Structure formats: C-alpha cells, structure tokens
Amino acid sequence: ENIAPYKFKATMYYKDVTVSQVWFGHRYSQFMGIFEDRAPVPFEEVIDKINAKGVCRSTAKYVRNNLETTAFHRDDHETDMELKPANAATRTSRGWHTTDLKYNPSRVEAFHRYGTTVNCIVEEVDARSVYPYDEFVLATGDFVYMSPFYGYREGSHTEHTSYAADRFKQVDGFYARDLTTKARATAPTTRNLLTTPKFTVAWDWVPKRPSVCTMTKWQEVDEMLRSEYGGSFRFSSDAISTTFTTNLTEYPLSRVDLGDCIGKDARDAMDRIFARRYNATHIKVGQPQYYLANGGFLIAYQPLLSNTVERIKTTSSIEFA
Amino acid sequence: ENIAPYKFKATMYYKDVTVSQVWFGHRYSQFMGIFEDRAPVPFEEVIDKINAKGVCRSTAKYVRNNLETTAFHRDDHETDMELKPANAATRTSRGWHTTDLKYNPSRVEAFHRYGTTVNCIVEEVDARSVYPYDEFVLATGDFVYMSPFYGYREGSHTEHTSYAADRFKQVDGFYARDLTTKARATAPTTRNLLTTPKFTVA
C-alpha cells in the first residue's frame, strides 16, 4: 500500500501589508498598534509584472472583510520594484522580496501617526496531497481546497473545487521566468493559478491518472518459487526468506483504484531482471499474472521455463511470512 | 542508533506588553483594539535586576519593526517590581511574574482612551536539539537558531549561529539566584544569554 503523499512544487505570491500607529511622547515613542495582513497578488500582476518584467507593484489592492481596500507602500505614489533574493537560511527553499525595512511615520510631538508598508513576497514551496486528492496543503501550513489536478482540459473539470470560478485561472503557453538567473524557459507549460483570500498559488498542471499510484513497488524477487497446494498458491523466496499465500484466482488490475502504475513498474522491473540474469538460460511463459496475498500484498509473477473498485490495505508487519 | 534529542534546561525572560483602546458609551464600554506584544528583557536587566535583586523594571524598552519602542506600566513612572510566583497548574514548570491585573483607562464619556500594561515574566523551559545540533527549540514552540554549544571557550565558537554578535553574551562567574528560595548557588557557572527579537534565553 502507498502511504506517501503526492508531492509537487508550487509558488506563492503575496503582499505583506503592515500599518503601524505610533505615539510620539516628550522623550520616548510607543506603538499603539500594528495591523499585519497578507493579501493575494492579482493574476494580472503575476502574469504581467512578476513573470514578464520580474518586478512587483508598490500597492496592494485586495478584498478583505467584504471591502475593496488599497494600501500604498511608504504612503507614496505607485511604482514598480525589483524582486531581490531573500537572505540565505539553511534548509530553506528559494524566496524573493521587494522591501526589507519597515516604514514608520516621522516624529511629530504629541500625535498618533499611521504608517503603511507593503512587502511583495514570492516563495517556492512543496505542496502535498493525499487520497482522494481533493485538497493539498503548502509548506507553510496553509490549505488549498481544490484538487491538484483541476483544470479545463482532459476531463479535469470534474475534480473537486471549493472556490468561485473567478478565483481560478488556467493559462496555457506560459513561459516561466527564473527570478535569479533571469533566464526564461522555452517549453510552454500549463499553469494553474488560484487566488485564495490570503495569497496566490501557481503550479504546473499534470493529468491525474499517470501522476499518482495507490500501490508502491516494494520488493523485486529474482527467484520466487510458486507452488500449488491445498487450493492455494504459495510464493516462497529464499532471498528475503518470505512466503505468501494467495487464492488460485487472478486479481484483476482494473479493480485497483488508480492502478495504471503497477503494470508499467512490474513490466520494467521484470524485463530488466530477465535481461540481466535469465536471458541465456530460461524463457518467459505468457504475460505477467497478478495475485493478492494475505496481508494485502500485490504479487506480479512472470513464470519461466528452462530451455530443456477498491483499495488494498497492507499490514505493517511481515513476521507472518 | 540514537534518536532521542539532546535535552537541557533554559530560562526565558520576556515582558508581555498589552495596550488597549476603549470607547466609553452612554451605558457601556467597548474594546476597539488590543495590541499584544512580547519584548525581550535586556542583558542589563537580566543580570543587574532579575539576578541581583530579584526584581524587574516596570517599563519595556525594546526594538520592534525597526523602531525603539518604550512602554510604561499603568502609564506611570518607571519603578522596580518584585517577581512573585505564578499560580500553580498541574504538570507545569516553574514561573514568575510581576503584574497580575490588566490596566484599562478610567471612564470618560464619549472618548477613545488608551492604556498600557507591562507584565515581566520569567519562565523555566525545556530545550531540545537534534543532530547536527545547529539550533534548538523551547517548550513554548519558539525556535532558537543557534547551536546549544556555541560560546567563546575551547573552540566552541565555530558552531552555527544566525544572530548578530550583539545579541550573544557569555558571562563566566555567574552566580544563579533562585527566585523562590532567594538563595544563590556558590559554584560559578558559564551562562549564555541570547536576546531574540521576542524573548531572551539563558
């Protein structure tokens, strides 16, 4: 059984907006409040500004608590700002930002003053999803309630989604721009972009069926002897000292949910082994057969001769074998 | 193989600064904002005040968002406040605090009023570090990005650190003062003090 979540790399775009209120006393200054918020970067700015020129806007315009709000960095006019790399930290993915210093209001004696700062942040994160792949979570602990394989092509519209159709956008012929080397890729890619109320996610779209596997290849056995006894099949391997018991009937591979993976992996492994070791001594007998063994194991078996819809649960213990 | 993390004892010093804005209506009062912040206790206050006298200042002077913020308890003059033990809870480590009650402004009709309270908190926590021991965590879930063995002694200055040299101070001949029994240990110890932006560890 496959327990490891499906992993894919995604990109987060968001503006950190900080508004600070300060009271300036006779000899001292004090914070009366710091409002910190995260705003999504619009698709217009992700495609037209960040990806096309490598810059980001100095203003954050977004909907929060049902209100169209605009914030200006340094409380000045709107300009474009270069995205520069963040400070290096061990075991941290790449990241880019525009500003580094907080803007606080100039001192005027005995007044409460407000000051706004906008920091446009781009990050690369690793996103993980689990069966049935209707949600995926980012490295920052923020969930995205939409299937990683959602789209407009190849029957991907039937995938689960919880956001309005105005929040999602699939752009084809998207040429990704590397933000460090400033070199643009040549192969076009499909890009899914979702604007959550807190941030914007973008990731490469891939079809669901050939991307995930509900069963994972565990062992390759060169010599797994098969015997028929007591209305059952015994598969015994001396290399791993392990014996499985199966019913005499085949297990159809179509019954396995998301089972396009087992056939290809088994064929590759068995062909490699046969070419390596048994090319000059034995011959294959028929196409590979698939059996289900106690414990919930899936055995792909290719018999040899000398020249002369449900999900399977696998136990954590191998001691019974 | 060893999977258990390396465990040691640490002490956290920090001041909880809460400033509240209140609107006083005709027959009611409303909280229109509560700013809560945690501030590090400076080295000049951990050694001179908390360890020497067992008291703490009633003001918080720290750096937040690239600005030197100063906050006064009850909006009054600076004064020394004695550290008293915290209320007991089950399965909890030792702790000490100065203030008990939040300060709110006196009622004045039809105005917005601001009020500041500072609570100086000292806590004993357990710290865990894993291989290759380039950073350690605390019981409160706050990471410290510096090797537990960092110092100035016997080649322990090659360990990992992510903080400016201004924030680390290693003091030898430190005589620890128990905040409950008010008794000071006789054996000198080498004490590392690091001032993170939100708290101070020793």
Partner: peptide, 20 residues
C-alpha cells in the same frame, strides 16, 4: 514552525534601527 519562524530573519532586517 521552523520554516514559519525564519520568515522575519529571511524577508526583513532585524538589527537596523531608523531614527530621525
């Protein structure tokens, strides 16, 4: 938590104090 608490060390400058 380890990644989230490095945010201020990565995308900001802690030490600088600005006064005018």
């Amino acid at each position: 938590q380890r990644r989230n608490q490095l945010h201020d060390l990565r995308f900001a400058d802690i030490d600088t104090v600005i006064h005018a």
